[PDB]
Structure 1
Amino acid sequence: TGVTAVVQKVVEACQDESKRLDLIEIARSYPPNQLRNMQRTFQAITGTFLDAFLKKHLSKDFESLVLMLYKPRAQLLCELIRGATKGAGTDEKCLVDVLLTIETHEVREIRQLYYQLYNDSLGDVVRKDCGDKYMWAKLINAVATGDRIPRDTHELEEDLVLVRKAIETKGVKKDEVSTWIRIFATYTRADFRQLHKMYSAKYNGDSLRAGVEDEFQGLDEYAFKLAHDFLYDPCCAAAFSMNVAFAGSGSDSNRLNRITAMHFRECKGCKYYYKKVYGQAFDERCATELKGVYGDAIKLLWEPVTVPLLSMDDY
Structure 2
Amino acid sequence: GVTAVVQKVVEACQDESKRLDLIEIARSYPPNQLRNMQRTFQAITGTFLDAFLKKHLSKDFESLVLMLYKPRAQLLCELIRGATKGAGTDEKCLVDVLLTIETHEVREIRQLYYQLYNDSLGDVVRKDCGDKYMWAKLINAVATGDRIPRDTHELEEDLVLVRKAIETKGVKKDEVSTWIRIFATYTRADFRQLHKMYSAKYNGDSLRAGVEDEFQGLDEYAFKLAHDFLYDPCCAAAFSMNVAFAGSGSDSNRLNRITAMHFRECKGCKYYYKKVYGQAFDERCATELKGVYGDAIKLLWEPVTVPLLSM
**Would you say same fold, with TM above 0.5?**
yes
1:200 deviation in Å? 0.6
Give distance in 1, aligned partners of 2:228 and 2:250: 21
- Aligned equivalents of 2:86, 2:21: Cα separation in 1: 32
Cα shift at 1:102? 1.0
Distance in structure 2 (CA, Å) of the matches to 1:86 and 1:258: 17
- For 1:194, what is the secondary structure of its paired residue? helix
Structure 1 residue 104 displacement after superposition:
1.9
Tell me whether 224-233 or 81-90 shows the greater mean CA deviation.
Answer: 81-90
Distance 1:95 1:297 in 2: 24
Which residue does 2:13 correspond to in 1? 14
Q: CA deviation at 1:112?
A: 1.3
What secondary structure, in the 3-state scheme, does the structure 2 residue paired with 1:308 have?
coil
Q: Secondary structure at the match of 1:174?
A: coil
Report SS of the residue matched to 1:136: helix
Identity %: 100
Pairwise CA distance, 1:155: 0.4
User: What is the CA deviation profile of residues 75-112 of structure 1, one whole-angstrom value per residue up to 9, with x for unaligned ones?
Assistant: 10000000002452000000000000111232222111
CA distance in 1, matches of 2:53, 2:156: 54
Q: How far apart are 1:263 and its partner, in Å?
A: 0.3
Normalized against structure 2, the TM-score is what?
0.99
Q: Which position in structure 2 is the counterpart of 1:299?
A: 298
The TM-score, its normalising length taken from structure 1, stands at: 0.97
- Give the total of aligned pairs: 311
Separation in structure 2 between the aligned mates of residue 139 and residue 86 of structure 1, nearest angstrom = 21
The CA distance in 1 between the partners of 2:49 and 2:160, in whole Å, is 55
Q: Distance in 2 between matches of 1:71 and 1:191?
A: 32
**Partner of 2:174: helix, strand, or coil?**
helix
Q: For residue 267 of structure 1, give the secondary structure of its aligned residue in structure 2.
A: coil
In the alignment, the residues of structure 2 paired with residue 88 and residue 13 of structure 1 have an alpha-carbon distance, to the nearest angstrom, of 37
Inter-partner Cα distance in structure 2 for 1:58 and 1:276: 34
Q: Who is 2:139 aligned against?
A: 140
CA distance in 2, matches of 1:93, 1:128: 16
- In structure 1, the gaps of 5 or more residues are none
> For the residues of structure 2 that align with 1:104 and 1:6, how far apart are their CA atoms?
34
C-alpha contact 2:99 2:139 (8 A) present in aligned 1: yes
* Structure-1 residue corresponding to 2:115: 116
SS in 1 for 2:175: helix
Q: Report matched runs for 1:36-75 at 5 Å.
A: 36-75=35-74
Structure 2 contact 84–125 (Cα < 8 Å) conserved: no
Q: Which residue of 2 is the match for residue 201 of structure 1?
A: 200
Partner of 2:25, secondary structure, is helix
SS in 2 for 1:205: coil
| Secondary structure of residue in 1 paired with 2:224 | helix
Describe the superposition over 1:11-34 as per-residue Cα deviations: whole angstroms up to 9, x where unpaired: 111111001000000000000001
Matched residue SS, 1:57: coil
CA-CA distance at 1:172 after TM superposition? 0.7
Contact 2:73/2:108 (<8 A) preserved: yes
Distance in 2 (CA, whole Å) between partners of 1:205 and 1:108 is 36
Conserved? CA contact 2:84–2:124, under 8 Å: no
In the aligned structure 2, how far is the partner of 1:247 from the partner of 1:71? 27
Alignment check: 8 A CA contact 2:98 2:106 kept: no
Deviations 1:129-165 (A, max 9, x none): 2110100000000000000000011000010110000
- The CA distance in 2 between the partners of 1:160 and 1:108, in whole Å, is 28
Contact 2:208 2:227 in 1 (8 A): yes
Following TM superposition, by how much is the alpha carbon of 1:125 offset from its aligned partner in structure 2, in angstroms?
Answer: 1.5
